[PDB]
Amino acid sequence: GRMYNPGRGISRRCIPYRRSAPSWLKTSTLEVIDEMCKLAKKGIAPSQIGAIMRDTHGVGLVKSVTGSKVLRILKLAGLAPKIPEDLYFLMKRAVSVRKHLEKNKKDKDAKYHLILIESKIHRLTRYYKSAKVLEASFKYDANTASAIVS
Amino acid sequence: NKKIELYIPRHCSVTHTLIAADDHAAVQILVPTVYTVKGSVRKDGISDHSLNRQFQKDGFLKTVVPKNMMI
Amino acid sequence: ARGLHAARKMLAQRRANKWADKEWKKGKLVTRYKCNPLGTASHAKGLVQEKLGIETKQPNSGIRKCVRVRLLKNGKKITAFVPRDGSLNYVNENDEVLISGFGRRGHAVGDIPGVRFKVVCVAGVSLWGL
Amino acid sequence: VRVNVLADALKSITNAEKQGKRQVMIRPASKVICEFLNVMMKHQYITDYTVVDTHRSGKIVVNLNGRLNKCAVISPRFNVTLSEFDKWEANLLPSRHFGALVLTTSYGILDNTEARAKHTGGRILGFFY
Amino acid sequence: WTPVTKLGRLVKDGKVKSIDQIFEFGIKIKEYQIVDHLLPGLKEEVMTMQSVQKQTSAGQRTRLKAYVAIGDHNGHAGLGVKCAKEVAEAIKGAMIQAKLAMVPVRRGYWGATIGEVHTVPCKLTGACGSVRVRLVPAPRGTGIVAAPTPKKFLILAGIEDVFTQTTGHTKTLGNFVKATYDAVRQSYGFQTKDLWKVGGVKQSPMDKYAKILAE
Amino acid sequence: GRCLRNHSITYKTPKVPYERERFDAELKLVGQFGLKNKKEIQRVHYMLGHMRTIAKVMLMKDAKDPKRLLEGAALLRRLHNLGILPRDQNKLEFVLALKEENLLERRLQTLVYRKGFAKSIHHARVLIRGKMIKVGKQVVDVPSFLVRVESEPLIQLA
RNA sequence: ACGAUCAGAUACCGUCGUAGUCCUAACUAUAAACGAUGUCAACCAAGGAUUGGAUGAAAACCUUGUUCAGAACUUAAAGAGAAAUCUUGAGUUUAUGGACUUCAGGGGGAGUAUGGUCACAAGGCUGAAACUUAAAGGAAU
RNA sequence: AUUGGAGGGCAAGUCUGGUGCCAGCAGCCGCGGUAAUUCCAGCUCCAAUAGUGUAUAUUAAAGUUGCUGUGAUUAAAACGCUCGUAGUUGAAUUAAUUACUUUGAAUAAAAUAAGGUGUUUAAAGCAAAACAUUAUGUUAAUGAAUAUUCAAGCAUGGGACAAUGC
RNA sequence: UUAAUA
């Protein structure tokens, strides 16, 4: 089930049993990389980059065409964001809730959910530090995250 | 000397388990071959279907049990 | 904690849960040396000072003859039964007696109203053979 | 969460046989699950099994024939010395001729009988009557 | 005498020569005289005489409840319960009930096939109320290591050697015997390795002699 | 411990003091063998229990274990020479089938009554205690003397 | 505080009525805070209906097929239990071992005394012993 | 030949004399208010026996301290609920240490187990002899291989299940 | 409307 509430949903995606590109797909890796490269320069999350390729270019799985994942492609081009995408979006929500909390001091449900969100951040930050993705000098602070997330 | 077993117990033709001496719901159907059904199977509402698989296996029925169920 | 490396909590849980044993805690905590008139000793000696008779419980009737004893080792004052028939007439005053327990029953035992000790000697031999 | 996949598999197999089911399905497949089934086949407790590949640690389907009373896994796999064998069999097995333990050893996953023959101990996995 | 059921008629005519034939096909025994014919000279032993009481407007109604165990010393046993106003009749009434409640007792060896059969083949557990009785196979020398109440029953069943481990309110005499009778009852229902072979096909005595019984 | 020597027990009291099933069974053995008290029955049970324990220990081992071969043969050899176990039964499984009557039927009191030197099993005890019976070369006054097979035909009056 | 009732009525019944009941800020941290049922995970007998989706058919609303999630309900000769009863478990347990945490050890004394700590206070958290007693208790006839 | 007992647990008296809810017995249930199976005695037999009762404590019984192995709806017992560090537990997958496992090395006896040995048996002792009729000879006679043995430490074969790899 | 105790 979900980490923090008793909800239990199994809404997933189903990768097909075909690790190679489909027969009808003809675009080579050069077009896929540059099309993905241009999207990264526009400030788009890697999760959304793949969706745009799937919806518009019909490249539903990039690993089936180029042999490497989106993040690996972006790292090679150097366009991977310094803050990991999943951690970045979590700190974007913590900032947004906090801003609402400044004017609405009596909201006791927003204080609870802000606590849950920040606990998630400390879980992800700890993991990424063991994975050497984030330097050990990194540390999440409310007075600082408002600027970097912005 | 004397035989070490009182008797050799019957085997249910469906679940391939022994028929206990106290199993007073176990039946025996003679098709002019012997079929044994354990009492637990009968009370569950399945012995009719289980016999259909066995009857179809031996040829007494042909177009009752579908192929995907013929196990 | 049923894991292979979870021996710290399993051992520590039995230490804590063992203190709830009424029969086991009583024999370990420091009360046998302060709250027990007899002490660890099986038998004790004392001086008879008063001849007493205690009425029995409600479903019984009669007077339980007994004696009041002042022990030597501690100096406490107790009450001691006088076993079988007519053995109180054999017990004199200001003499040494041997006092020795009873079973333990529901704590108290056989002279009913709170007595838990029985006179086994009168200086002499026995408040049996006597 | 799924801590022991083998525990999930053996509970599925035991539950299926108590209901008299013909074949059962196990969703997560492992090497250890396959080895445990192979030991049970050599003693003719299960007819056979097939492994489907789902690219996602695929599934196993096991065919049962009225013979497996109970197969259960043993929680934390104790380091079983060779001298501790008969102590374990006296506890877990019905008699001296019926059942068999399962142990993981450097020479593979073996039951108690041939592990005794090969003169090797190891962690205990489970048993079956 | 004067049989009513088929099995009663068959045994009176001497066509079912062995009680094991009845147990083979799981036929219910409804006349205690059937067991008397097939198992002559059964030893007897009365477990207890417990008196129950029912409150009434005029007072209490005391009845005597008898637990009697029957069974030859060669692998058969039976337990029956009956309550009545008289001790003499209650034993007789429970005497009947014990005979219809005959069950086969499967016993085996400990480590080798040398001698005659003495002990249970595997581990069995009685499933009475709070009482639960476990039987473990034992070597030749050890007797029936058990409380007197199930030791008396296990002696009749012919189990010379066994180990026992009881659980529950074993002071309840009625459930203590009932738990032992239950563990013994399912001895032949537990499929061991030697029973895998399906054996041969046997004819039921009620089908082979169906014609004569009608006539 | 305080003494440098060794002292060991030879019998054990039963767990349940009062049973009618046990009382008559012991009396059957007392009458059949003329024993002084139940302490002599208990010694036989203890002695039998020791050998039964030994055989039971090695029966759980493998057949070809060197430990089993050394102890199993030694236990059987001691049994054969004592006369308890007949020579035909050379398997450890026959030790578990032994009973207290087998050991009791090898006391010197039993043999001299069976050999006909005394009229009754009680007369055998009196004859033994009176230094009247000799086994080979040395007189014996202890009726618990368990005679070996080799000393079995060497029993005669004094 | 009155008036009734009653032997008495400081109560139930009626009339009046202070703190309180309401909002803001700060304390308090306890309830039969209950599903008297810890959290996570696997397997699991027949149904009919309902809440929110997805997906076919039938022209948002409604009637149907499938499937995912949620609060429930009915049947069981089956499993369990001391039984009542439980079945989206209280099942898969003497055939005893999926992972982790908390709690209990006959009834009283007693959640009391003392010590420590938190609070403005009432109180909360931790928390015995002496002594006493063959029963107290649970489900059912 | 004594010690304890003869209502049940627990083998043994519905025998006779006194006692009259008194004296008392009674580890627990309980028996005694004048017809006591339980008091005090007489006779008898019940158990053990040169031992047998009592009192305190250890162990088993106790699956009433739980690793094997308990219980938590109602009997006592799921924190009011969520977050959370240490701790514990962690999906499938690959044809340098540690842990695990097998053999050993080394390690005081006594003790435990166990090998031999007629202390007349036995507990013992590690001696005595079996026969050589023994000085001679077995013989330069036995010393149980005497095995242990857990937690560490040392070496060795294996790498399945695991931890730190880097 | 009132109805306590053994």
DSSP letter for each residue of chain F = ---SS---------SSS--HHHHHHHHHHHHHHT-SSHHHHHHHHHHHHHHHHHHHHHHTS-TT-HHHHHHHHHHHHHHHHHTSS-TT--STHHHHT--HHHHHTTBHHHHHHHTTSSSSHHHHHHHHHTT-EEETTEE---TT-B--TTTGGGEEE-
Token pair listed for E146: 């058990």
Structure-token match 């006539």, residue found: E215
Strand partners of residue D102: D111, D126
User: Amino acid identity, residue C39?
Assistant: G
Q: CA A101 → CA A104, A132, D89, distances in Å?
A: 5, 33, 64
Method by which the coordinates were obtained: cryo-EM
Q: How far is the CA of F56 from the C1' of H66 (A)?
A: 30
**Which one of E118, E140, E155 makes the best mutation probe of the F interface by having the most chain F beta carbons within 10 Å?**
E140
Check if residue D23 sits with its Cβ under 7 angstroms from strand H: no
Beta strands in chain E (DSSP E): 44-55, 60-70, 76-84, 102-104, 124-125, 132-136, 144-145, 162-167
* Cα A3–Cα A8–Cα A11 angle in degrees, nearest 5: 105
Residue type at position E149: T
Using the beta-carbon criterion (under 8 Å), do D97 and E191 form an inter-chain contact?
A: no
Range 1-20, chain C: CB under 7 Å to any strand G atom: 1-3, 6, 9, 13, 17, 20
For residues A50 and A33, give the distance between their C-alpha atoms in angstroms, rounded to a whole number. Answer: 11
Nearest CA to C114 out of C126, C123, C104 is that of C104
Q: Is D57 on the interface with A (CB under 8 A)?
A: no
Angle formed at CA C117 by CA C113 and CA C118, multiple of 5 degrees: 110
Question: Could you tell me the end-to-end alpha-carbon distance of chain D, in angstroms, rounded to an integer?
Answer: 28
Long-range interactions of C7-11: CB distance < 8 A, separation 24+: none
**Residues composing chain D:** 129
Task: Please give the C-alpha separations between residue E143 and each of D60, E212, F12, F32, F40, in angstroms, as whole numbers.
Answer: 48, 48, 17, 22, 21
CA E172 to CA E169: how far, in whole Å? 6
SS3 C40: coil
Helix A85-103 vs helix A108-130: crossing angle, to nearest 10:
160
Q: Supply φ then ψ for residue E181, to 5 degrees.
A: -65, -30
Q: What is the C-alpha separation between C119 and C126, in angstroms, rounded?
A: 9
- Note the maximum CA span of chain C: 70
d(CA D116, CA F62): 10
Cβ-contact B29, B51 below 8 angstroms: yes
Sequence-separated (6 or more) residues with CB below 8 Å from residue E47: E67, E68, E69, E149, E152, E153, E173, E177
Q: Check: CB of residue E19 under 8 Å from CB of residue E92.
A: no
C-beta atoms of E111 and F93 within 8 A: yes
Beta bridge partners of E119: E108, E161
Pairing of strands F133-135, E124-125: unpaired
C-alpha span between E68 and A120 (Å, rounded): 70
Beta strands at E144-145 and E162-167: parallel, antiparallel or unpaired: parallel
Instruction: Decide if D70 touches E, using CB distance below 8 A.
Output: no
The values of phi and psi at residue E201, to 5°, are -95, 125
Quick check: E49 and E87 in contact, CB under 8 A? Answer: yes
| CB < 8 Å to D67, chain E | 191, 196
- Phi then psi for B50, rounded to 5 degrees? -60, -40
Contacts of D66 in chain E (CB under 8 A): 191
What 3-state class would DSSP assign to D95? coil
Identify which of A9, A59, A56 has the alpha carbon closest to the alpha carbon of residue A33: A59
Give the C-alpha separation, A16 to F158, whole Å.
Answer: 105
Structure tokens at B2: 């004397």
List alpha helices for chain A, DSSP H. Answer: 29-41, 46-52, 63-66, 70-77, 85-103, 108-130, 142-149
What whole-number distance in Å separates Cα of residue E152 and Cα of residue C63? 47
Separation between Cα atoms, residue C41 and residue C59, nearest integer Å: 34
- Based on C-alpha coordinates, what's the Rg of chain A? 19
Reading the block at residue F23, the tokens are: 């009382």
CB pair distance less than 8 Å for E111 and F59: yes
Q: Which residues of D79-116 are buried (b: 16+ CB within 10 A; e: fewer)?
A: ebeeeebeebbeebbbbbbbbbbbbbeeeebbbbebbb
* Residues in chain C, overall count: 130
Rounded Cα distance between A51 and A46, Å, is 9
Q: How many C×D Cβ pairs under 8 Å?
A: 6
Give dist(CA E91, CA F95) in Å, integer: 42
Residue D122 β-bridge partners: D80
Is there a contact between F97 and E111 if contact means CB atoms under 8 Å apart? Answer: no
Q: Do F97 and E115 touch (CB under 8 A)?
A: yes
- Residues near F145 by beta carbon (within 8 Å), at least 6 away in sequence: F107, F108, F135
Cα separation, C32 vs A121, in Å, equals 58
At E5, is the secondary structure helix, strand, or coil? Answer: coil
Chain E residues touching D94 at Cβ < 8 A: 122-123, 192
C 2-41: CB within 7 Å of strand H: 2-6, 8-10, 13-14, 17-18, 20-21, 27, 40
D54 touches chain A (CB under 8 A): yes
Residues in Cβ contact with D105 at an 8 Å cutoff, skipping those fewer than 6 apart: D115, D118, D120, D121, D122
Q: Which two tokens stand for residue D79?
A: 């380091």
Residue E140 near residue E110, CB atoms below 8 Å:
yes
Closest Cα in chain C, distance from residue D79 (Å): 10
Q: Which residues of B touch D66 (CB under 8 A)?
A: 11-12, 15-17
Nucleotide nearest to E136 (CA to C1'): G94
Tokens of F86: 């007949």
Protein A107 CA to nucleic acid G122 C1', in Å? 30
Burial class (CB in 10 A: 0-12, 13-18, 19+), C112: middle
- Which residues are CB-neighbours of D124 under 8 A, at least 6 positions away? D74, D77, D78, D80, D88, D101, D102, D103, D104
Residues of D in contact with C3 (CB under 8 A): 76
F74: Cβ under 7 Å from strand H?
Answer: yes
Please give the structure tokens belonging to residue D98. Answer: 């019926």
Max CA pair span of chain D: 43
- DSSP code for D55: S
D101: β partners:
D127
CB distance C83 to C96 below 8 Å: no
Q: Which of E39, E18, E17, E19 is nearest to E29 (CA)?
A: E19
CA atoms within 13 A on the CB side of B60: 13
Pairwise CA distance, residues E179 & E169, whole Å: 11
Pick from D23, D82, D21: which is nearest to D47 by CA? D23
What is d(CA E181, CA E79) in angstroms, rounded to the nearest whole number? 7
D8 CB contacts (<8 Å, ≥6 apart)? D2, D26, D28
Nearest residue to E147 via CA among E162, E137, E157, E158: E162
Nearest to F127 by CA among F110, F152, F150: F110
Experimental structure resolution, Å: 3.1
Look up tokens 């009620």; give the residue. E206
E108 burial (CB, 10 Å; 0-12 / 13-18 / 19+) is buried
Residue whose C-alpha is closest to residue B2's, from E120, E184, E75, E72: E75
Residue-wise over C20-54: b if at least 16 C-beta within 10 A, else e?
Answer: eeeeeeeeeeeeeeeeebbeeeeebebebeeebeb
Name the one residue in this structure whose structure tokens are 């024993």: F35
Q: Are strands E60-70 and E44-55 parallel, antiparallel or unpaired?
A: antiparallel
Q: Which nucleotides of H are covered by protein (CB under 7 A)?
A: 10-12, 21-28, 30-33, 39-41, 46-50, 54-58, 63-69, 82-85, 87-94, 100-103, 110-116, 118, 120-125, 144, 157-162
Cross-strand bridge partners of residue E145: E163
The reply to whether the CB atom of residue D3 sits less than 7 A from any atom in nucleic acid chain H is yes
Q: In the structure encoding, which two tokens stand for residue B70, read together? A: 């013929």
How far apart (Å, rounded) are the C-alpha atoms in residues F28 and F18?
17
Q: What is the CA radius of gyration of chain B?
A: 14
> Which E residues in the span 162-191 are in contact with B, Cβ-Cβ below 8 Å?
185-186, 188-191
What distance in Å separates the CA atoms of residue D106 and residue D127, rounded to the nearest whole number?
19
Query: Alpha-carbon distance F75 to F89, whole Å?
Result: 13
Angle CA(C21)–CA(C26)–CA(C29) in degrees, nearest 5? 110
**Exposed/middle/buried for E14, CB within 10 Å: 0-12, 13-18, 19+?**
exposed
Structure tokens at E77: 């046993």
Which H or E element spans position B19?
none
Can you tell me the distance from the alpha carbon of D93 to that of B61, in angstroms, rounded to the nearest whole number? 43
Longest CA–CA span in chain A (Å) reads 59
- Tell which residue, B25, B67, B31, has the closest CA to residue B47: B25
The residues facing C124 across adjacent strands are none
The answer to whether residues E161 and E178 touch, using CB atoms and an 8 Å cutoff, is: no
DSSP bridge pairs for E144: E162
E144 CB-near residues (< 8 Å, 6+ apart) = E151, E154, E155, E159, E160, E161, E162, E164
Nearest to E188 among B20, B24, B30 (CB): B20
| Angle at CA of residue F156, ends F151 and F158, nearest 5° | 125
Residue A86 one-letter amino acid: D
| CB–CB contacts below 8 A, B to E | 61
Nucleotides of G under 7 A from a protein CB: 24-25, 39-45, 68-70, 77-78, 80-83, 91-102, 104-106, 129-134
Strand stretches in C13-128, DSSP E: 44-55, 63-71, 77-81, 96-99, 119-121
Please give the helix or strand (H or E) that residue D48 lies within, else none. strand D46-51
Cβ-contact F90, F75 below 8 angstroms: no
The answer to whether chain D touches chain C by having 3 or more C-beta pairs less than 8 angstroms apart is yes
| Whether B19 contacts B38, CB under 8 Å | yes
Amino acid at D37: L
Dig out the tokens for E117 from the structure. Answer: 């059969």
Q: How many other C-beta atoms can be found within 10 angstroms of the C-beta atom of residue F144? A: 14
DSSP state of A9: -
Tokens standing for F104? 């009791």
Rounded to whole angstroms, the Cα distance separating E19 from E39 reads 7
Residue F148, both tokens: 């070996």
Residue pair D14/D72 in contact by the 8 Å Cβ criterion: yes
DSSP D83: G
- d(CA F103, CA C124) in angstroms, rounded, equals 51
What is the distance between the alpha carbons of residues E19 and E33, in angstroms, rounded to a whole number? 12
